[PDB]
């Protein structure tokens, strides 16, 4: 295993809060939704994450419970990740 060296980040002026919703959001449904272990991993700032994992070893999962668990994840790995490039979403 490890100690923890996640490392450290910068604070820039550009959609700063704005992230924070949508996060926010995402885990507090990781959390309130079944997967207490989701909503953990970006709070440690491990993010992005393996979602074509949490696919695999779930494959037991509907399409439908794994879309939208999904749903989520991915909102948050481009939100946990966006510092390095902002990400132009069709804009």
């Known amino acids: 295993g490890s100690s923890g060296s996640s490392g450290m980040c910068r604070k ?4 700063m809060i704005l992230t ?17 272990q989701y909503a953990q991993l970006y709070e440690d700032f491990l993010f992005p994450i393996d979602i074509s994992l949490v696919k ?3 494959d ?10 999904c749903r989520r994840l991915n909102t948050l790995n481009k939100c946990a990740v966006m510092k390095l490039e902002s990400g132009p979403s069709s804009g």
């Open 12 to 15: 820039k002026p550009d959609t």
């Open 56 to 58: 695999r070893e779930h």
């Open 20 to 36: 924070q919703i949508e996060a926010k959001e995402a885990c507090d449904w990781l959390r309130a939704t079944g997967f207490p």
């Open 60 to 69: 037991f999962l509907d399409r439908d419970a794994i879309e939208a668990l």
